[PDB]
Design a protein around this nucleic acid. Structure first.
Ligand SMILES: [Mg+2]
Ligand SMILES: [Mg+2]
Ligand SMILES: [Mg+2]
Ligand SMILES: [Mg+2]
Ligand SMILES: [Mg+2]
Ligand SMILES: [Mg+2]
Ligand SMILES: [Mg+2]
Ligand SMILES: [Mg+2]
Ligand SMILES: [Mg+2]
Ligand SMILES: [Mg+2]
Ligand SMILES: [Mg+2]
Ligand SMILES: [Mg+2]
Ligand SMILES: [Mg+2]
Ligand SMILES: [Mg+2]
Ligand SMILES: [Mg+2]
Ligand SMILES: [Mg+2]
Ligand SMILES: [Mg+2]
Ligand SMILES: [Mg+2]
Ligand SMILES: [Mg+2]
Ligand SMILES: [Mg+2]
Ligand SMILES: [Mg+2]
Ligand SMILES: [Mg+2]
Ligand SMILES: [Zn+2]
Lengths: 50, 114, 69, 99, 91
RNA sequence: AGGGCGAAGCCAGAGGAAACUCUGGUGGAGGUCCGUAGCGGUCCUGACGUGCAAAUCGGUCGUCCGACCUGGGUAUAGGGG
RNA sequence: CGUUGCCCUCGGCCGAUCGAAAGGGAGUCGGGUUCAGAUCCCCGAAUCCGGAGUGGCGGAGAUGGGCGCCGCGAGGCGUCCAGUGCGGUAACGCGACCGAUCCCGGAGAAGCCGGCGGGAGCCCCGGGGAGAGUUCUCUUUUCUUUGUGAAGGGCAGGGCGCCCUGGAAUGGGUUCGCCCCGAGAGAGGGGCCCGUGCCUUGGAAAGCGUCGCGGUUCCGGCGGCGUCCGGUGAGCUCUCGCUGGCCCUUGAAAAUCCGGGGGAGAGGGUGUAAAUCUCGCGCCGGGCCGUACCCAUAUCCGCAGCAGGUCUCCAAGGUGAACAGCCUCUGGCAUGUUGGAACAAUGUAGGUAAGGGAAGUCGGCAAGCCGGAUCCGUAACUUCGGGAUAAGGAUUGGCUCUAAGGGCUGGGUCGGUCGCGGCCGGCGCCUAGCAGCCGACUUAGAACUGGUGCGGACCAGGGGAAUCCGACUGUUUAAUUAAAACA
């Protein structure tokens, strides 16, 4: 909005940190079932806890 | 023609968001935001509709800054009340007290008579 | 800022503790003398050139006298 | 008053691209005064010749950049507006130069 | 009757509202906009400010009067009675 | 937006014995008219009708100083508002 | 001298608290700078608020007057009082000018609409420059560009329901409109407020425009020149101001800030004090959170880059009544999720049609006619206001002329004397005014002219006679009913 509270800004920050894709060294771990992050949120489609 | 934008996030044209055009040394017309128009104080009499002389009509929280002389005038009831209403108050307050004395005298004569 | 009208007055303002740079703008036909202070930038317009050249010497202890060009 | 405008064409003439006498003649023809082309409006403006330098000397009010116009017109006629450029060297002056 | 024969003040209303109502309004509509005489200075400046309150512009004497007239008749008749009784009581 | 009509008040001139009346101005009233933005939504029973659209589009329309339009805040909650 | 404990002394409130990124609410602006941030970074100019004890400094308070001596005199001492500033007839003024609880007042703090005026921004016109484009012919060309922040100081320019003089009917003054006057008009002199306008400090050093160099480079390099003068206005936008109109409508509170009335107190004793709603300068501080971008025919909501929806600011030239439409510059785009080749039928959206003119159809549905302006001319009926652009007519182009509408400035000339200018005295006294110099724009009339075309596109009423319903304006079924329903 460009007029944020601090509460909201911090919320957004964490959401922004969560988006990154898996580190590829994770795929090489021993008992690995994970191939892709599957919790990736694109701003244009799917619109936050808000 | 150079059109222009507001300089603050207040979009709406309001009492708060009043402006004026100014040419800078950079040679670009720019909005400057303008200070509200202060009023001279009206009289303590309350009948004289005209506002007071010899007072800097300025937004009241400024008065703080101003010197005492700007804020008033050298008279009894100075910068609170218009002269006319003082010199009527004066002679009123005097003439009233002279009659109160006359009634006191007429009372005292009536006591001495009776 | 503040303009000054007496050569003495600018000399007194220049002699304060708070003062510093006393830059000198030869405009042609004018020769200003801008002396910064804490609050204000005092200037003094000295129309004569020889009188400005004389004053140049009269600033005191080793101030900046940062002549302007 | 005395309005004295030079119009020096030093190194187009030295390269031999134009002739200053013909340019003078063209200027004596054209330079209009009060909406009359020929005869310099009588003995009003005066055109001088000094090999390269032209000088125009008026008594009446006379624009400087009217000389720029007429040089530009003359340069077009001679097909020189391509590698010749009029510039104000200084005030009271123009100056033909290359690119 | 320069401009209108018989509407005057209530010509503003045009055709609307009916003849009787517009005739009925003309009486008030006149009186309420009338400038009366300030029985205080004597200038003709008593002008209704809002209902029941008339103000002299010169005198600066605001005066509680009628809704459409500086004086109602009722007020006037009440005034005189009170004055009569006042005199009857005190003697 | 811009136009139209031109209410009270005011001026002059003319008549009138008076009452007052005419003529020319000025003045700018109004849930006044035209008409833009705005708000709306008449008709074409037009377009569209697996649409651009789970109600849209085009022209044509109503209204456009007022029971006007409109943001934000605030109140009223289900046999209740 | 602080700090605290206790004792006395005084003290109404009014409801704790929450409630506005558009209400109220002190104080920041110019230039530069980034791949992306700037009133926030840098440079420079400011500014408010709080603190400032020991008070950092000046200045004000405040340094008179008397008497007595001594000294030629300037003056020196002794001793007595005065001194919480002064000016103006007044409006009110001057840099400061003690002061509590208490009280009164003001500011914050006010609707809409009209008209008129002043100030800017923009547009326009005439010229100066600098760079342009055009140049077959013409064009002293057409195009661009031509600057000064806040805060101070000065001065215009506005306004005054301020004062003093004085006394107005033959009544005057005066507005576009009004409106004012013995409760003081005109006339003269002043006082106050705003001064966003000029000038100036700021500030040319900075910016912009040009020509030019320095540097293979890096480089915010460095120089020249210039940044001028005038005129216009129912012009538009904003604004300040005055003055009306409307209301059975009368159009926010509070925080905060000041003024005044009071006079409880405090100050030192003749060089100083307490005091500065402190004057000028000096010192220190100002934490917390927001600050990217989109803001919409692709960043929002309608399942989507959806013809829908979604609150504002700025707002050039031409034509024109116009923020109408049509064309243009500034700025912006690539035709709205594709291309190519054809040009069949059906369509969707536009047009045109001989003769007739509603014969079509439930029904003139649809389209067509009409349309602007000026000049005439205008019925029935009527609630006398309307009806009314009733109806019905005529004109309209281009060109070349005419007439009619305004401002400014100027005579005190002759004689004398003093420095073209002044001062004095006498004539003159345009008192029917005349002379020179400027500048918008309209209106009417006339000639000529064209293949009768001319509101040439754009914009832009079809009328009439009657009946029914509802007086009217208003409202209504979001998404089949706008009505005669509701009001
Ligand atoms: Mg979305
Ligand atoms: Mg606000
Ligand atoms: Mg004062
Ligand atoms: Mg259909
Ligand atoms: Mg289909
Ligand atoms: Mg599509
Ligand atoms: Mg709160
Ligand atoms: Mg007077
Ligand atoms: Mg931003
Ligand atoms: Mg936009
Ligand atoms: Mg297309
Ligand atoms: Mg394409
Ligand atoms: Mg698209
Ligand atoms: Mg046909
Ligand atoms: Mg048939
Ligand atoms: Mg038939
Ligand atoms: Mg039809
Ligand atoms: Mg009819
Ligand atoms: Mg019947
Ligand atoms: Mg109805
Ligand atoms: Mg419906
Ligand atoms: Mg419908
Ligand atoms: Zn008073």
């Amino acid at each position: 909005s460009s007029h944020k509270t601090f509460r909201i800004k911090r919320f957004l920050a964490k959401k922004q940190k969560q988006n990154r894709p898996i580190p590829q060294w994770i795929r090489m771990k021993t008992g690995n079932k994970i191939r892709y992050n599957s919790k990736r949120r694109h701003w244009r489609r799917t619109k936050l806890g808000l | 023609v150079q059109r222009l934008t507001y300089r603050r996030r207040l979009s709406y044209n309001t009492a708060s968001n009043k402006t004026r055009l100014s040419r800078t040394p950079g040679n670009r017309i720019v909005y400057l935001y303008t200070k509200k128009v202060g009023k001279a104080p009206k009289s303590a009499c309350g009948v004289c509709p005209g506002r007071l002389r010899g007072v800097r009509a300025v937004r009241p929280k400024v008065l703080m800054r101003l010197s005492k002389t700007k804020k008033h005038v050298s008279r009894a009831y100075g910068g609170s009340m218009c002269a006319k209403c003082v010199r009527d108050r004066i002679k009123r307050a005097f003439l009233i007290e002279e009659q109160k004395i006359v009634v006191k005298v007429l009372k005292a004569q009536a006591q001495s008579q009776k | 800022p503040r303009k000054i009208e007496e050569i003495k007055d600018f000399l007194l303002t220049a002699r304060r503790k708070d003062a510093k740079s006393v830059k000198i703008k030869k405009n042609k036909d004018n020769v200003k003398f801008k002396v910064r202070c804490s609050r204000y930038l005092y200037t003094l317009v000295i129309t004569d050139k020889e009188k400005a050249e004389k004053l140049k010497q009269s600033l005191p202890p080793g101030l900046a006298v940062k002549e302007l060009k | 008053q005395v309005l004295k405008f030079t119009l020096d064409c030093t190194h187009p003439v030295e390269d031999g691209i134009m002739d200053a006498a013909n340019f003078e003649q063209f200027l004596q023809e054209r330079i209009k005064v009060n909406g009359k082309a020929g005869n310099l409006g009588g003995g009003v403006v005066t055109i001088e010749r000094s090999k390269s330098k032209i000088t125009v000397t008026s008594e009446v009010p006379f624009s400087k950049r009217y000389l720029k116009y007429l040089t530009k017109k003359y340069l077009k006629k001679n097909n020189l507006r391509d590698w010749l450029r009029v510039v104000a060297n200084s005030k009271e002056s123009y100056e033909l130069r290359y690119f | 009757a320069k401009r209108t024969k018989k509407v005057g003040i209530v010509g503003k209303y045009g055709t609307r509202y009916g003849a009787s109502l517009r005739k009925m309004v003309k009486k008030i509509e006149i009186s309420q906009h009338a400038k009366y005489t300030c029985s205080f200075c004597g200038k003709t400046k008593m002008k209704r400010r809002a209902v029941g309150i008339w103000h002299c512009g010169s005198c600066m004497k605001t005066v509680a009067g009628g809704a459409w007239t500086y004086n109602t008749t009722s007020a006037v008749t009440v005034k005189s009675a009170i004055r009569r009784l006042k005199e009857l009581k005190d003697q």
